[PDB]
Write a protein that binds this ligand. Structure first.
Ligand SMILES: Nc1ncnc2c1ncn2[C@@H]1O[C@H](COP(=O)(O)OP(=O)(O)OP(=O)(O)O)[C@@H](O)[C@H]1O
Lengths: 735, 386
């Protein structure tokens, strides 16, 4: 009459020896209700993945509760039986015929053990069960030589009539005291591919997020493994960690990794499915799951899609499930225990949608900032996945991987898997189309398929707050030495003069203005900073910050400056100011005025942002209103005029690297003297036009002739008027 | 939110007693810090008094929960740093220091930085640089109400309740409010110009009502506005064809139907032409202060204050000829010039013990005053016409 609908897994305590493969501590009432002999095999449904891990069954001492069951850590590791999963029980299957090979693999070892063996056969098949897809046991205490090793037993050649049983367990028959069929020790490779059994995710899979990975490791290990030390302080234990970031940036994968690597019990929810029409059903479910969380000392709770579960009060008062359940769960978890060991991880997205009623340091102090991976993280993930898929199926050197990572700048973490899989299908398709079903092992991975892959992938991750556009080195930096020296001075002062400023009280002006001609030397500065500074660089476009909705620009400004402040002492760059700055010359709207006042009162109002440095580059400086153009904020001014002869010559040399200067007979000195009124972008465009004219003569060329140079020079003019330079000089004089 | 509460509930018939809880100030934050430090005792950490005072002074907008947040963040950062560096050493030996607290206050980033009532940090008289006549005037104007309300009740004269501050945008407009708040020993209210402005129509009126009846419920005090010229001009500037309701509300609040004898209203504006003729009427805001550029004495005092960090004897400057040469500047201008001169003096060999006269001359010639005589002439004409 008990009718146990569901079961939950539980680790086997007390170690000892016991069964260790066929423990199966289930209450005798459940066994009687299943009309199955206790002294026989038992089957655990584990909801899905048929085969059911058929295993012999034993009896308990009436102390083991009915709800929890034990399946031994060996089977838990074999079948990835994560704690808190749904477990079911049903009738046993048919008796297996026999076992054939059962061969050891000696995982994470160099094999050649001979002495370390010491008759492993008795240990392997001195126990009931022995399921050949996997046995994982402790090293125990054998002879001298300490250490710890594991064994792979996956490979086998036995054939079973029913294909439903993917675990295809068989009986055990070996002779020993205190031998299979023609020895049982051979090979050392990885697990058998034909079974394709699931594997537990490890920390080695996650790459490019180290500075966060050890942070989260410590955040989950200090309370769980050291509860007494933290409780001695008496400052209350943290009961929540915020995992927020753009979708597909590697959050659920780390959730799975930490769930698999932790032996403690973990609670996993599927999200809004708990929400029910009955008002009290969700409350009862929440209080119940909290009861199992608090009754067991080790417990970790996972919550997902909190925004759907907990909508903002002001955003929409839909009703039904609302902040009532949030309040009751917060009250339940507030006083569940005094010290305990409980950590809650919230894998949410864009915390603006997260209800403001979920943010106090008392329970949710820990916040994890996840952003778009940079080129280094993308390259690291590429290397990790290449190592995972092994070199037996592909050939690729390091520089090609680096170039691929550099090419993909705005791509997301999941985009890397997208590209590799798309390259796989493209290679298979081209092989089938061309070679007419040739051996696909020799085709492997090439560059053409990957090139077509990122040509045709078309990701939907272009519009983001982060702007990780590709950078250039000092070779492309064509300008004046004084400008570079000033740049170095004002980017090295806050890095190694913070203590001096604090002692003196001068602090930092934190304001640099870059106004000049629209030719060049106004956009390459962002690359120069992002390259040489080695600090997290944020760039916001002018029209990008503008939005149709009223106040959207203001709130976006709020998030961008709050994240700049929270992202350590760094530099903020705004590309185009003269669209929102002219609130007096043009009528504009109230949103532009609100933006102007917000940016005026946030840079140096109320609170001072000493850590961050604010630099702004604008085309026409007269659009900036004099209300915010006050000494003490953005006081520094740089003329940054047209490039001189040296910068133009350097740009010409850089652009002429592909061509051969010796055969052309040009030193690029007379051309530089003639091309004095142009800009760096103008020089690049003229060089491109000259190259196009040269290659239109006889298709591909190895050199460029003078006639193309004169044709390009006469075809395109400077496009800049001297009166603009005079006006710039007049503005500089008044400043 | 008291506003979100049903106004039917919030009536004196049932809920006449209201307990107002505001943001803790420096003193309250220091008291809470000391109390919690004594709570977890010195057996696990060492924290001398002056470090606690410095931490409390550095805290401006933090809330009661923020102190606990900082404590927990510092403790956990100490734990991780000890585990990373000392390889699981005893945590009692590492205890608590100042650098982890500084890192915690840098990285805490509270979301309560927006508030209707601003607690502007206090400043002492010696740091304040002004003129003797203005100081005597403000002292008299603030001493009259507190110990003359009973005399005015019998006399019936009451108080002018209106003070207007118009002058150059250089200085003597912002730090004056801090000096008044410090010396008066009365709760101070600071609201920015565009802060009262809101996108929603009618939200500004509700904020105006909010601030005035909190001022009324906060005992006879002083109400100061950072700048009025951002909303006072309606016909002259035509600011989004709005603010007329705000102007009418502020006109009828000060002296409409009900008169506020206890409180004193002080106004500071950056330009006189933006004030409408309705406000420029005898009886309300009649008092006007020229509050011009600082004189020689104030500039000399500011230079002496800024030179305290450096050594005057080593530099050799007498702090008189520099003040005489820099006569057309302002207090903020003087501070900025001193900061830039210090930067120039430290560019050579990083930290220095003194600033040379050559660096001061470089600063003076590099940066101009930026002030024109036409605005001074207009201010003088307005003073004569007033
Ligand atoms: N940074 C990354 N590095 C490597 N693989 C990644 C990364 N981000 C995503 N992936 C791949 O894409 C899959 C989906 O990502 P993940 O499971 O982390 O979910 P998510 O989309 O970030 O989370 P959610 O659905 O909660 O928003 C991963 O299982 C992994 O295969």
């Amino acid at each position: 009459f008990k009718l146990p609908a569901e079961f939950i897994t539980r680790p086997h305590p007390s170690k000892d020896h016991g069964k260790e493969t066929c423990t199966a501590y289930i209450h005798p009432n459940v066994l009687s209700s299943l009309e199955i002999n206790p002294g026989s095999f038992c089957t655990v449904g584990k909801i899905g993945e048929n085969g059911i891990l058929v295993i012999a069954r034993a009896g308990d001492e009436e102390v083991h509760p009915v709800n929890v069951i034990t399946l031994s850590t060996t089977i838990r590791s074999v079948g990835n039986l994560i704690l808190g999963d749904r477990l079911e029980l049903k009738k046993a299957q048919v008796q297996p015929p026999y076992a054939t090979k059962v061969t050891v693999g000696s995982l994470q070892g160099y094999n050649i053990l001979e002495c370390m063996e010491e008759k492993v056969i008795q240990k392997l098949l001195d126990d009931s069960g022995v399921i050949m897809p996997g046995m994982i046991f402790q090293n125990l205490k054998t002879k001298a030589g300490d250490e710890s090793i594991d064994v792979v037993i996956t490979d086998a050649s036995d054939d079973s009539l029913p294909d439903v049983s993917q675990l295809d367990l068989n009986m055990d028959d070996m002779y020993g005291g205190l031998g299979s069929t023609h020895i049982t020790f051979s090979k050392e490779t990885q697990a058998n591919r034909k079974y394709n059994l699931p594997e537990p995710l490890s920390y080695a899979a996650v790459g490019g997020l180290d500075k966060e990975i050890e942070s989260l490791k410590s955040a989950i290990e200090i309370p769980l493994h050291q509860p007494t030390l933290f409780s001695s302080f008496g400052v209350s234990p943290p009961r929540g960690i915020l995992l927020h970031g753009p979708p597909g940036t590697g959050k659920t994968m780390l959730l799975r990794v930490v769930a698999n690597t932790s032996n403690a019990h973990v609670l996993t929810i599927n999200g809004p499915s708990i929400v029910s029409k009955y008002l009290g059903e969700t409350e009862a479910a929440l209080r119940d799951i909290f009861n199992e969380a608090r009754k067991y000392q080790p417990s970790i709770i996972f919550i997902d899609e909190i925004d759907s579960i907990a909508p903002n009060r002001a955003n929409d008062d839909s009703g039904e499930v609302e902040s009532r359940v949030v309040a009751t769960l917060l009250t339940l978890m507030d006083g569940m225990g005094a010290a305990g060991k409980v950590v809650v991880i919230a894998a949410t997205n864009r915390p603006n949608s997260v209800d403001p009623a979920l943010r106090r340091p008392g329970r949710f102090d820990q916040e994890v900032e996840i952003g778009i991976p940079d080129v280094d993280a993308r390259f690291d993930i590429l290397t990790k996945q290449f190592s995972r898929m092994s070199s037996d199926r592909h050939v690729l050197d390091s520089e090609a991987i680096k170039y691929i990572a550099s090419k993909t700048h705005g791509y997301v973490g999941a985009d890397l898997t997208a590209l590799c899989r798309e390259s796989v299908m493209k290679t298979i398709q081209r092989g089938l189309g061309t070679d007419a079903n040739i051996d696909k092992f020799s085709l492997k991975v090439t560059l053409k398929d990957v090139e077509s892959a990122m040509v045709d992938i078309r990701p939907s991750a272009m519009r983001e707050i982060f702007l990780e556009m590709p950078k250039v080195y000092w070779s492309d930096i064509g300008g004046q030495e004084e400008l570079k020296t000033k740049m170095k001075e004002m980017i090295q002062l806050p890095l190694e003069a913070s203590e001096t400023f604090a002692r003196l009280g001068i602090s930092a002006p934190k304001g640099v203005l870059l106004y000049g001609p629209p030719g060049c030397s106004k956009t390459l500065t962002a690359k120069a900073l992002a390259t040489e500074s080695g600090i997290n660089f944020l760039a916001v476009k002018g029209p990008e910050i503008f939005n149709k909705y009223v106040g959207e620009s203001e709130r976006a400004i709020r998030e961008i400056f709050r994240k700049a402040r929270s992202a350590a002492p760094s530099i903020i760059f705004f590309d185009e100011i003269d669209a929102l700055s002219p609130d007096r010359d043009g009528s504009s709207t109230s949103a532009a005025n609100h933006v102007l006042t917000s940016l005026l009162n946030e840079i140096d109002g109320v609170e001072e942002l000493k850590g961050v440095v604010i630099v702004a580059a604008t085309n026409r400086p007269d659009e900036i209103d004099a209300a915010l153009l006050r000494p003490g904020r953005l006081d520094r001014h740089i003329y940054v005029g047209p490039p001189d002869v040296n910068a133009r010559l350097e740009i010409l040399k850089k652009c002429t690297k592909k061509f051969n200067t010796e055969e052309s007979g040009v030193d690029l000195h007379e051309l530089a003297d003639r091309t004095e009124g142009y800009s760096g972008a103008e020089v690049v465009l003229l060089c491109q036009e000259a190259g196009l004219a040269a290659i239109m003569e006889d298709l591909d060329v190895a050199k460029v002739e003078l006639r193309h140079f004169e044709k390009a020079f006469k075809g395109i003019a400077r496009g800049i008027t001297p009166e603009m330079l005079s006006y710039y000089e007049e503005f500089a004089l008044r400043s």
